[PDB]
């Protein structure tokens, strides 16, 4: 769920910080 949120970000090339 948090895992799914993170994965949605990565599948969409969102830049994570640090």
């Amino acid at each position: 769920s948090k895992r799914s949120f993170i994965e949605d970000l990565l599948f969409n090339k969102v830049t994570l910080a640090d």
Partner: antibody
Amino acid sequence: EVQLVESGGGVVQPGGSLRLSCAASGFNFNNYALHWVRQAPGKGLEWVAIISYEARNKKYGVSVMGRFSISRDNSKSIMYLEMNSLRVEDTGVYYCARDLFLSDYDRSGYDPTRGGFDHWGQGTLVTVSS
Amino acid sequence: EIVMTQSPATLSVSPGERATLSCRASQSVSSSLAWYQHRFGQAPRLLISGASTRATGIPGRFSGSGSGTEFTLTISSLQSEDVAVYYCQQYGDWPLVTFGGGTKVEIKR
């Protein structure tokens, strides 16, 4: 103890369709992204597709996009690759693989250094030919 | 998207000597890098993930190092069972993972 058993390879005519299966055992199937990887004669490993642990996200190699469809049954622990409009150049050995990425999330959170395909199927031969 | 480039294409190493394989990423992958052994007629086998963490059951004569865009796999005391094609794979860009083109390791005679 972790095991991935592939099935469904065979001969198909150009333009035809084929469904590959990857039956998993010995681990919590629902905790892992899984991929398909293939090898054409004389060529290196080529990534085909990924499906996320809860089946919500999917991506495809540029060579197969729009023709292949990846899915998973998270109650019988089986992954599928549906291949439509097959081309002669789709010929090769097809492997399923278990991805470690984010699989330890519940215990250790987000660690993008953890990854790799730690278990692979035995491979199934797909022959596209008239 | 991220292109992985392995060298040399073929590596010839004397029995019992050390094989050094190189992998370059076209942009930084931090240490999100894995190495695989692919023996002829078998399924690929994970050797290293996280650039330098040996996978379970992998002997200590296999090791890796590097971060950013340059990586190395070292195989000490090369044995004929090590003859295989070796692939690197980045997952810094996960889920868009990508493989190197492979390095063939052979016994020199």
